[PDB]
Design a protein around this nucleic acid. Structure first.
Lengths: 55, 55
RNA sequence: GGAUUGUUACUGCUACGGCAGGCAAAACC
């Protein structure tokens, strides 16, 4: 995977291999980071998955 | 609904009746906003849901 | 950038309670 958009120093977005938008929050797993690098799985505390807002 | 947390003016976290954490992405929906208030459903562009980083 | 919000790195400070810097963001200027 890869960072799609850094939301904060402990939260970043990332497109899954399938093509879904996912968010990865963790202890400083997004500090001074950028898009294109793989999300550090060792610092992943919570992963969110894009859902349908219609529901 | 309610704003549990905020990462940036466009994305924020929120807890539903299931007791799970969900992230709500939108355009400038978190600007000048805070936690505790109901999440603006009209500003919800993409919703997210906490998952297990183990998978 | 400016500003406005967010924050858990790490840092500087201390009253050593935390607090601010930094860092980030798709408002707006």
């Amino acid at each position: 995977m890869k960072i799609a958009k850094v939301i904060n120093n402990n939260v970043i977005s990332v497109v899954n291999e399938q093509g879904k938008e996912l968010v990865v929050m963790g202890r400083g797993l997004a500090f001074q980071k950028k898009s294109g690098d793989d999300v550090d799985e060792a610092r992943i505390e919570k992963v969110f998955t894009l859902d349908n807002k219609d529901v």
